[PDB]
A paper describes a structure:
They are binuclear metalloenzymes, highly efficient catalysts and display broad substrate specificities that include most phosphotriesters. The active site and substrate-binding pocket of the PTEs are also well defined, with an iron-zinc binuclear metal center co-ordinated by four histidine residues (His55, His57, His201 and His230) and aspartate (Asp301) and an unusual carbamylated lysine (Lys196), which bridges the center by co-coordinating both metals (numbering for PTEAr). The large, hydrophobic substrate-binding pocket can accommodate the majority of anthropogenic phosphotriesters, including insecticides and nerve agents, and is responsible for the broad substrate range of the enzyme.
To investigate further, we superimposed various conformers of malathion onto the substrate in a crystallographic PTEAr:substrate complex. This revealed that the substrate binding pocket was too small to accommodate the branched leaving group of malathion, with particular clashes near Ser308 and Tyr309. Although the majority of transformants from all libraries retained some hydrolytic activity against malathion, only the library in which Ser308 and Tyr309 were targeted for mutagenesis provided variants with increased activity towards malathion compared with that of the wild-type enzyme. However, the Tyr309Ala mutation did expand the size of the active site entrance substantially. To investigate whether this increase in activity was a result of relieving the steric hindrance that was inhibiting substrate turnover in the wild-type enzyme, we performed substrate docking with malathion and the engineered Ser308Leu/Tyr309Ala variant. These results confirmed that the widening of the active site that occurs as a result of these mutations allows productive substrate binding and vastly improved turnover rates.
Residue numbers in the entry:
A (entry chain A), B (entry chain A): 33 to 361
Write the structure that this text describes.
């Protein structure tokens, strides 16, 4: 009680976050895209409605909070987030940082400047809204680019200054987490303030246990993603992989079995709109996982219980871990 | 009389465009950047004020219209343009198209989709404003990327459908114009609807005359840009070049001397804010060219007259050529 986290509708007690999905999206897009070309999504109204329906479904399944890790370059639209959050009655935590699609205007900035931008979004508010970011999202896709190194350093600096956690995108097969950790540690950031994302994209437990042993959160955040049965579709295969949801889920058990229950964060990396991919992908995704953001509570959690994970352990993963991670520290 | 062109404040008679700068920017930025981080520019208010001052200065020097060729990916802000246009009493023509910094959400689109986006901006309006684009801006930086080819084709298609002209960014030293022309012609676009930009960045008149002979407009649009005296500054050298304004200006005479007066368009490619470059560049630019967008009327035109170009020829370049180019055809 009494620690607070910022959401798109304002501050909430940490204890109110409850069952929380720590890596999600309302819309995966680009800065200004939804504004310039809402028809891409049928309409802004249609997108919002679809999002409210999905969130209501998640809520019925027990989800109380989502962390929307859409950055400026993922086309994050805080007004949209606030609208859908209110209508679905689900908390949404907004993000700052930068993903792997930064425009030149960001790419040309110094580490000091980036830090100031991240700080603005956390401390003051996003755009002209007063809506403050509750998390910092950063990314590599293999070995960090020089700009990416700066971005990670700025993220560490903003976090140390505000207590807001850092969360990442990785090319998990390339073990990006090791480099990301090295950079964060070089800045003095505690591993406990950091989640190494898309970790379920790999079955290399040496890599994963290695991070966990050091105190990192391991983000198992792509639970619904599989191209199994549609390798006909090349975009889907590259995007979704050939591993099943069960294989991904088994990683959660694997880590618990290895003593790392307190270090796990679980999510879908789902969305309700998606312009970051060729046009048909959203439909394909909807066909594969109609449960959307209810998939983890509906399918993953019962799978785990059936494999013998205790309910209290599962509560700790879905409730306690997100609460510790989010609470500014 | 009676042909109309769209501006940020609405429709105007073509005959009212008058002395027109066909390649300009209020702000060279990125989509959503000015919204997310106005402090980068001191403030939105400060940027607008600086722009009004520069435009008023241009207006006093005789400029009546500018074409702001900032695309979605140049962070074009139509509301800003409209605000400054009204306050400075200078017409501004807005653009659609895409520059060389497109985000993934654009990169992932088909030629058909891009065409629909360009058409939306021309026919319906930009974002939710009702402000319609009067031009299409496209870009290559050397050999066209595959996406760039699609963008050029969509631009040709939108132009044929609406009559709005197409204007380009080139790496002039690499002779991009030849390839851009080939693609436009493959789509059936008339060369008269096309301006091949940044053509003053090269002294290869074989290249330039070649375009002109085919009926292309040659955009001599970087008149004030030189790093002479500041090769100490590496960013400035790469950006500005080592050729003087006089050398650039001589190209205008060169083309007139070769029979191509009707094929020339002249501009500054100036701006009042600039986040697309490292932070100090705007200041450096202001120091070199305090006249801003008044530089062409103040310095270039008198230089030309002094080298014997007749006033009526100069009027034709600065008034008649832009009018023919802009008038939807
Ligand atoms: Co990601
Ligand atoms: Co250019
Ligand atoms: Fe994501
Ligand atoms: Fe330009």
């Amino acid at each position: 009680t009494g620690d607070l986290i910022n959401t798109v509708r304002g501050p909430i007690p940490v204890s109110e976050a409850g069952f929380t999905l720590t890596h999600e999206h309302i819309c995966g897009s680009s800065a200004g895209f939804l504004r310039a070309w809402p028809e891409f999504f049928g309409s802004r109204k249609a997108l919002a409605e679809k999002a409210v329906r999905g969130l209501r479904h998640a809520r019925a399944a027990g989800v109380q909070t989502i962390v929307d890790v859409s950055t400026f370059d993922i086309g994050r639209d805080v007004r949209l987030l606030a609208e859908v959050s209110r209508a679905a009655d689900v908390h949404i935590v907004a993000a700052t940082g930068l993903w792997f699609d930064p425009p030149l205007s960001m790419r040309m900035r110094s580490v000091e400047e980036l830090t100031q931008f991240f700080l603005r979004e956390i401390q003051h508010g996003i755009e002209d809204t007063g809506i403050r970011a509750g998390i910092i999202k950063v990314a590599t896709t293999g070995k960090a680019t020089p700009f990416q190194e700066l971005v990670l350093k700025a993220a560490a600096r903003a976090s140390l200054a505000t207590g807001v956690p850092v969360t990442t995108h990785t090319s998990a097969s390339q073990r990006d987490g090791e480099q990301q950790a090295a950079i964060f540690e070089s800045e003095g950031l505690s591993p406990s303030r950091v989640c190494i994302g898309h970790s379920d994209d790999t079955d290399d437990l040496s890599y994963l246990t290695g991070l966990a042993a050091r105190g990192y959160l391991v983000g198992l955040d792509r639970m619904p993603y599989s191209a199994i049965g549609l390798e006909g579709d090349a975009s889907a295969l590259a995007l979704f992989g050939t591993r099943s949801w069960q294989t991904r889920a088994l990683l959660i058990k694997a880590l618990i079995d290895r003593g790392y229950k307190d270090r796990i964060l679980v999510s879908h990396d789902w969305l309700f709109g998606f312009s970051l991919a060729v046009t048909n992908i959203m439909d394909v995704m909807d066909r594969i996982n109609p449960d959307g953001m209810a998939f983890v509570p509906l399918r993953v959690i019962p799978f785990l219980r059936e494999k013998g994970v205790p309910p209290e352990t599962l509560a700790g993963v879905t409730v306690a871990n997100p609460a510790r991670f989010l609470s500014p520290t």
